[PDB]
Amino acid sequence: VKPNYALKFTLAGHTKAVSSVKFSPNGEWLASSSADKLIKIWGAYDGKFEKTISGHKLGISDVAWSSDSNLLVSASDDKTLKIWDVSSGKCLKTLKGHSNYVFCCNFNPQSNLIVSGSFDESVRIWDVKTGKCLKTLPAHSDPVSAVHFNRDGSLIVSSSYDGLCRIWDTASGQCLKTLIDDDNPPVSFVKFSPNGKYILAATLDNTLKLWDYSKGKCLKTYTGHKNEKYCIFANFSVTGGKWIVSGSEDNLVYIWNLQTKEIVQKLQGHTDVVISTACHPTENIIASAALENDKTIKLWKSDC
Numbered sequence: 001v002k003p004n005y006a007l008k009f010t011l012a013g014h015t016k017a018v019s020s021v022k023f024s025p026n027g028e029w030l031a032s033s034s035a036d037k038l039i040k041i042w043g044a045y046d047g048k049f050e051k052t053i054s055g056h057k058l059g060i061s062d063v064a065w066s067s068d069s070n071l072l073v074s075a076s077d078d079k080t081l082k083i084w085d086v087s088s089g090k091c092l093k094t095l096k097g098h099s100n101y102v103f104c105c106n107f108n109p110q111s112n113l114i115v116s117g118s119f120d121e122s123v124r125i126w127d128v129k130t131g132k133c134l135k136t137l138p139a140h141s142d143p144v145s146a147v148h149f150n151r152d153g154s155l156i157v158s159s160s161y162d163g164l165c166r167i168w169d170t171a172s173g174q175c176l177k178t179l180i181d182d183d184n185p186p187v188s189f190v191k192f193s194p195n196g197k198y199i200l201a202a203t204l205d206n207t208l209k210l211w212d213y214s215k216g217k218c219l220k221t222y223t224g225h226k227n228e229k230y231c232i233f234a235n236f237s238v239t240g241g242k243w244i245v246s247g248s249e250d251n252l253v254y255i256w257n258l259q260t261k262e263i264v265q266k267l268q269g270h271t272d273v274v275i276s277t278a279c280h281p282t283e284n285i286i287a288s289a290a291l292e293n294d295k296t297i298k299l300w301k302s303d304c
């Protein structure tokens with residue numbers, strides 16, 4: 001079986017490269033962040049522009065939703081994260097502590113915590129309600145490219161240009177695992193599978209790998225796309241067929257069969273690197289976004 005994703009809407013409005021798009025957990029909204037220092041909110045189903053959220057002093061590299069879909073956190077080159085109340089647009093808290101660009105962020109499922117990763121090579125864990133940093137983890141020896149909580153928030157996974165993926169105990173901050181295969185090219189993205197059994201890791205040798213974390217072994221490898229320079233988001237698609245989804249430096253969205261690792265679709269339309277993809281939580285919808293020469297977000301829909 002293959003999906004049949006087809007372009008439905010193109011969302012224009014950012015005036016510089018888009019950085020990261022994310023669907024709200026309740027399925028109603030898409031948030032985007034950009035090098036233009038703005039967050040924008042769009043309807044998930046119709047692509048209709050809703051509102052702009054502003055306040056960072058420099059470009060934004062990542063954005064993430066709270067579990068109740070009411071808050072956003074953003075990660076900026078201005079070395080801060082901000083927590084936003086989406087309905088009012090108010091910045092609730094500015095999270096200060098990183099000493100260089102903040103590149104990646106996420107809420108835990110309970111959404112009482114935020115995890116962040118930075119060019120300062122650290123991973124930080126923040127309290128949402130106080131805005132204070134609870135822990136600084138000496139996570140890596142190069143910039144941190146991604147951070148993600150597992151399904152019950154007990155674990156954090158991080159990746160770095162140092163070629164490592166590491167698993168952290170949220171409560172204690174201790175490093176539980178370092179994953180390394182036969183080589184250690186820069187790791188440009190990582191996230192847990194929905195069931196929390198696996199980890200999907202991208203490396204800058206045009207490769208994605210599915211790891212059994214607990215046993216510390218690689219199970220699957222996905223190739224055919226181009227990824228040697230940029231930190232591109234990747235996803236598990238689980239609403240229909242079971243796919244791996246990623247952007248690519250040849251301006252396409254790639255979709256693989258998770259099991260057989262074969263490419264099942266390549267989505268054409270963007271005019272620059274597809275830096276970010278996201279999968280809708282209940283419908284077969286993909287959002288994609290591209291860098292400076294394109295500036296648009298695209299919504300694609302499949303019947304399976």
Ligand SMILES: O=C(NCc1cccc(-c2cn3c(n2)CCC3)c1)c1ccccc1
Nearest residue numbers: 019061062103104145146189230231232233
């Ligand atoms: O990937 C890069 N730039 C493209 C870009 C721009 C804005 C956001 C992102 C981004 C954020 N996150 C990711 N990519 C993966 C997980 C979090 C990348 C990059 C920038 C400086 C040195 C090495 C690589």
